[PDB]
Scaffold this active site. Structure first.
Site, PDB file in Angstrom:
ATOM      1  CE  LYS A   1      35.406  54.266  39.454  1.00  0.00           C
ATOM      2  NZ  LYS A   1      36.533  53.604  38.737  1.00  0.00           N
TER       3      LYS A   1
ATOM      4  CG  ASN B   1      32.318  52.580  41.356  1.00  0.00           C
ATOM      5  OD1 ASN B   1      32.779  53.479  42.073  1.00  0.00           O
ATOM      6  ND2 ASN B   1      31.426  52.812  40.400  1.00  0.00           N
TER       7      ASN B   1
ATOM      8  CG  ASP C   1      38.249  52.000  36.309  1.00  0.00           C
ATOM      9  OD1 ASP C   1      37.611  51.794  35.281  1.00  0.00           O
ATOM     10  OD2 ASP C   1      37.931  51.290  37.399  1.00  0.00           O
ATOM     11  CG  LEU C   2      41.387  47.921  40.437  1.00  0.00           C
ATOM     12  CD1 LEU C   2      42.823  47.637  40.063  1.00  0.00           C
ATOM     13  CD2 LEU C   2      41.174  47.850  41.972  1.00  0.00           C
ATOM     14  N   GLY C   3      39.492  48.375  37.510  1.00  0.00           N
ATOM     15  CA  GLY C   3      38.971  47.347  36.607  1.00  0.00           C
ATOM     16  C   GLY C   3      39.076  47.748  35.147  1.00  0.00           C
TER      17      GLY C   3
HETATM   18  O1  LIG Z   1      35.045  48.337  39.308  1.00  0.00           O
HETATM   19  P1  LIG Z   1      35.994  49.463  38.922  1.00  0.00           P
HETATM   20  O2  LIG Z   1      37.425  49.251  39.343  1.00  0.00           O
HETATM   21  O3  LIG Z   1      35.492  50.870  39.125  1.00  0.00           O
HETATM   22  O4  LIG Z   1      36.063  49.387  37.366  1.00  0.00           O
HETATM   23  C1  LIG Z   1      35.634  48.274  36.612  1.00  0.00           C
HETATM   24  O5  LIG Z   1      34.240  47.899  36.831  1.00  0.00           O
HETATM   25  C2  LIG Z   1      33.635  46.986  35.883  1.00  0.00           C
HETATM   26  C3  LIG Z   1      33.419  45.570  36.433  1.00  0.00           C
HETATM   27  O6  LIG Z   1      34.627  45.008  36.965  1.00  0.00           O
HETATM   28  C4  LIG Z   1      34.456  46.970  34.600  1.00  0.00           C
HETATM   29  O7  LIG Z   1      33.765  46.319  33.514  1.00  0.00           O
HETATM   30  C5  LIG Z   1      34.800  48.411  34.291  1.00  0.00           C
HETATM   31  O8  LIG Z   1      35.227  48.430  32.950  1.00  0.00           O
HETATM   32  C6  LIG Z   1      35.970  48.773  35.190  1.00  0.00           C
HETATM   33  O9  LIG Z   1      36.497  50.124  35.223  1.00  0.00           O
END
Ligand SMILES: O=P(O)(O)O[C@H]1O[C@H](CO)[C@@H](O)[C@H](O)[C@H]1O
Ligand SMILES: O=P(O)(O)O[C@H]1O[C@H](CO)[C@@H](O)[C@H](O)[C@H]1O
Ligand SMILES: [Mg+2]
Ligand SMILES: [Mg+2]
Lengths: 199, 199
Positions: free
Chosen positions: A143, A110, A8-10
């Site tokens: 996802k 995402n 995962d990134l965020g």
């Molecule tokens: O957007 P990504 O990289 O899938 O992932 C991210 O999305 C959301 C908004 O940034 C976060 O709160 C999630 O915890 C995180 O995994």
């Protein structure tokens, strides 16, 4: 026995905080931050924007309507660009280490990037640490959809049992689990270091 | 005996990193980050912009010329908006504490904010922690100029001996010292907590 690691990134590779975006919009429009926070919902526009099904402009339109934001696209994008992002260097270090050990390392995000914004997946530190970066907007998938995980497995050429996936979202974890991917819920900054220290 | 505390903003109340701005510009123009870093100099345009003597557009023009950046103002400003900024909550906490003790707490910053950007001095966390925020662009003056310190002392109604000033820039420290202000060079994140723990 080479493995596939999907990160995962965020809130996994980076800390990210959209309260700074709302702060920027609040400062410009004078609409109280709390009111913006109350109306800032993840709904259909997010799901569609993440899969690349609506334009940045249409995404911006939907959010501005929902939040009563009198912003131009440029003002929307400027606020969006202000998002707080901090690297977790300990994760970057692990990614580099896994790769020098011959394992496959990819990112799966995402993304709500805009064509006008510099976004975490574009950061050289992240681009340097991964073999490939899979983005929902490039794939037309997001996802926790089974299809996005399957797409990665096929593209990389790894079976589910040879794959390890880290994400801080339970639905994402469940969606990968259903395909037999070893999926580790990231609860906080300790999860990934602990996983890779403790065996 | 009520005191006047003057806090630098950049690298004192917040961590700030312009490498993220250069990253944004590099990503857009495809000009290597390292080349941007090499040509990113603090010169006359900075001094003038900080004192409010040239417009945001003129500032943007000068930097783009110096760095060979083919950017519109909007693209310049968007990159600028990407600057990395993290609060030092321990400093914010001290500022709140000093104030509830009846001491005067102000911020003094040489700002390169644009009218189009949400900048640290506008962050509610910082605005909440200070009695007043003195910005170079509002005053037509910049640290380390004697006149900016004098302006603050006069506006707040405090003598130099009743004043304590924190800044991570040696020239700024020297400029305040010359007026007899007690001036503490901020060497790192430990300086301010140590000062306020250790008496
Ligand atoms: O957007 P990504 O990289 O899938 O992932 C991210 O999305 C959301 C908004 O940034 C976060 O709160 C999630 O915890 C995180 O995994
Ligand atoms: O700009 P300010 O708030 O005076 O202060 C800041 O300026 C520079 C650029 O951000 C920093 O490197 C200085 O260390 C810091 O004090
Ligand atoms: Mg980009
Ligand atoms: Mg502003």
């Amino acid at each position: 026995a080479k493995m596939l690691y999907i990160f995962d990134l965020g809130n996994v590779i980076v800390d990210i905080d959209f309260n700074r975006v709302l702060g920027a919009w609040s400062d410009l429009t004078r609409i109280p931050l709390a009111s913006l926070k109350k109306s800032f919902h993840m709904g259909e526009a997010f799901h569609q924007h993440e899969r690349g099904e609506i334009s940045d402009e249409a995404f911006a339109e939907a959010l501005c309507h929902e939040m009563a934001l009198p912003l131009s696209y440029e003002q929307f994008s400027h606020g969006w660009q202000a998002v707080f992002v901090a690297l977790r260097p300990e994760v970057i270090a692990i990614m580099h280490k896994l790769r020098e050990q011959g394992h496959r390392v990819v990112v799966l995000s995402n993304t709500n990037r805009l064509h006008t914004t510099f976004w975490p997946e574009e950061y050289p530190e992240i681009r340097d640490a991964a073999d490939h970066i899979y983005l929902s907007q490039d794939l037309g998938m997001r996802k926790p959809e089974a299809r996005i995980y399957q797409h990665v497995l096929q593209a990389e050429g790894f079976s589910p049992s040879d794959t390890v996936f880290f994400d801080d979202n339970a639905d994402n974890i469940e969606g990968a689990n259903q395909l037999g991917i070893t999926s580790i819920l990231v609860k906080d900054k300790t999860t990934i270091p602990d996983y890779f220290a403790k065996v």
